[PDB]
Design a protein around this ligand. Structure first.
Ligand SMILES: *C(=S)NCCOc1ccccc1
Ligand SMILES: *C(=S)NCCOc1ccccc1
Ligand SMILES: *C(=S)NCCOc1ccccc1
Ligand SMILES: *C(=S)NCCOc1ccccc1
Ligand SMILES: *C(=S)NCCOc1ccccc1
Ligand SMILES: *C(=S)NCCOc1ccccc1
Lengths: 305, 305
């Protein structure tokens, strides 16, 4: 029993973290086979700092301008190239600790673990969801750029996120590992801001099922609702629409607890309209939306890597 | 910016996790140098199951009754002994991945990471506090016994917890790595139950400081209180007393934010008496008590391992 925000074990990713330095700028890189991936802003100078041309900045660089350290070992850079907003530093040694890996781009509402790192050294690990507005609510201090987000499936690490910056509301933005930003964000100085966000309805339902599996039942009721009457209430409370595909994805949890998805939707409608009246669900006084249906199933069934 | 419940990177502990089997009972062990540590209940039979004598059960065992697997490699058991409620299985191979480590016993109100494991394989990592009643609120399914809790300081792993069982309220109990239970719990069948618990006041204050460091200030006020008037209110709301030593420990956070500890105590008194009036602090509608002052400082300053 119990339900916790749980990250993936981080070892396979720890063995890939290196430090990348250009001039006085130091950040983290991801060392896989003989390539080190890092945010391209590591090549920024003090000359523009506003709208600089990265292609110009990179033409002016040489391999020996990039200092890459893996623990105490300096790695020799033997090529460099740009990949959208990430840099690819070819080094002369393949990382002997390279796991099985894939680069995947995730969807809003999906979750992943973040290994927060400073100076190539891991400091902590936690779970993030990609918000509907393509930001993440992380914990990142100066120096943490280049930290990555990932999921692990058996022995395969799917890298989905590299950290690039903090927006003015204190939330975080970054790219997939092909260097393409999540959301309408750029690695140049602008007044860019997080757009309006919404609550991930299918995840809130998944978390109510987790609560039932763990013995919290007080919010259950004898009612069922239709998908459209539910979605009318959802819209009113800034929740995303619930699709039939979401209902299908919740199938396994509905089956394990014998509570129909539309039946649970009636419970969510009541919680949205009336609040919790001083009660809590899985130790929270708010409705939690950062657990996917798969996150619930994996934690209630016991899958390992 | 941002504040997240963050676990330690788990790699150093992943490389110590093995599977221990006796008969049909399989659980996890911790392989350090040439010793595997695991809960002694792995030797339980179906014969008593109530109040069995572990010393008798262990005399009846032979080394070859213990099957220890490290990944795909079987480890040869060459001695066995009892250490309070843990078993020490001497094996013929030292673990080449043994980190620098210490066995430390922690205090109620201190936090640690848990690497949840099944069949010797890590499945997830999360942060726990040791509650005042010596339970922890974890996420553990059948098979997870022998999972460990730890902190990491530079390159040193301090192991503080091994998981033994779930109590009837769904919270978890276990031992230090010398095999001594936290709290008044036993590894035999009884009606034992978690005693009454209280909220860890110094941690709630630490978390209010974290909130201020991250820009949540709405609960601040111009008042200060005395330590005794604060502790009168604390007692009334089932909070632990705040000592002068707690005030001293909060010194660094008080200094960074320029808000005196007694000044912050006035804020906590108001929150306890009036609630949050629909607001949140660091994304919570409840007062959070599972972050120590050190946890806040480490996450706001950026220490790594
Ligand atoms: C190099 S100086 N680029 C100009 C601004 O750089 C950044 C903008 C936003 C995030 C990170 C770097
Ligand atoms: C990640 S280490 N972020 C710290 C500051 O980001 C910038 C890096 C380079 C130019 C501008 C901003
Ligand atoms: C999961 S990430 N699988 C993708 C690549 O799988 C392998 C990689 C290297 C060796 C064998 C399989
Ligand atoms: C062996 S059968 N011991 C009797 C009861 O065993 C346990 C009691 C509580 C937790 C774990 C094992
Ligand atoms: C940890 S794997 N717990 C599962 C059940 O615990 C027991 C083990 C042996 C005897 C009694 C209970
Ligand atoms: C931190 S856990 N230190 C305790 C033991 O330190 C060492 C262990 C092994 C080799 C060197 C130092």
């Amino acid at each position: 029993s119990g339900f916790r925000k749980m990250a993936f074990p981080s070892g396979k990713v720890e063995g890939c973290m290196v430090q990348v330095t250009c001039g006085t700028t130091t950040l983290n890189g991801l060392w896989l086979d003989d390539v080190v991936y890092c945010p391209r802003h590591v090549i920024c100078t003090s000359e523009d700092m506003l709208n600089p041309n990265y292609e110009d900045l990179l033409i002016r660089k040489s391999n020996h301008n990039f200092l890459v350290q893996a623990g105490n070992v300096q790695l020799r850079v033997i090529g460099h190239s740009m990949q959208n907003c990430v840099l690819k530093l070819k080094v002369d040694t393949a990382n002997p600790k390279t796991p099985k890996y894939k680069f995947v781009r995730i969807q809003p509402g999906q979750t992943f673990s973040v290994l927060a790192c400073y100076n190539g050294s891991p400091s902590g690990v936690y779970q993030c969801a990609m918000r509907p507005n393509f930001t993440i609510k992380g914990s990142f201090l100066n120096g943490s750029c280049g930290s990555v987000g990932f999921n692990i499936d058996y022995d395969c690490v799917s890298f989905c996120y590299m950290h690039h910056m903090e927006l003015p509301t204190g939330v975080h933005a970054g790219t997939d590992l092909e260097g393409n930003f999540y959301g309408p964000f750029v690695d140049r100085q602008t007044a860019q801001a997080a757009g309006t966000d919404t609550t991930i309805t299918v995840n809130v339902l998944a978390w109510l099922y987790a609560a039932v599996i763990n013995g919290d039942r007080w919010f259950l009721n004898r009612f069922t609702t239709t998908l459209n009457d539910f979605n009318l209430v959802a819209m009113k409370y800034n929740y995303e629409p619930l699709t039939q595909d979401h209902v299908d994805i919740l199938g396994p949890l509905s089956a394990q607890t014998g509570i129909a998805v539309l039946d649970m939707c009636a419970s969510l409608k009541e919680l949205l309209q009336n609040g919790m009246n001083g009660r809590t669900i899985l130790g929270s006084a708010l409705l939690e939306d950062e657990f996917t249906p798969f996150d619930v199933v994996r934690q209630c069934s016991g899958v390992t890597f």
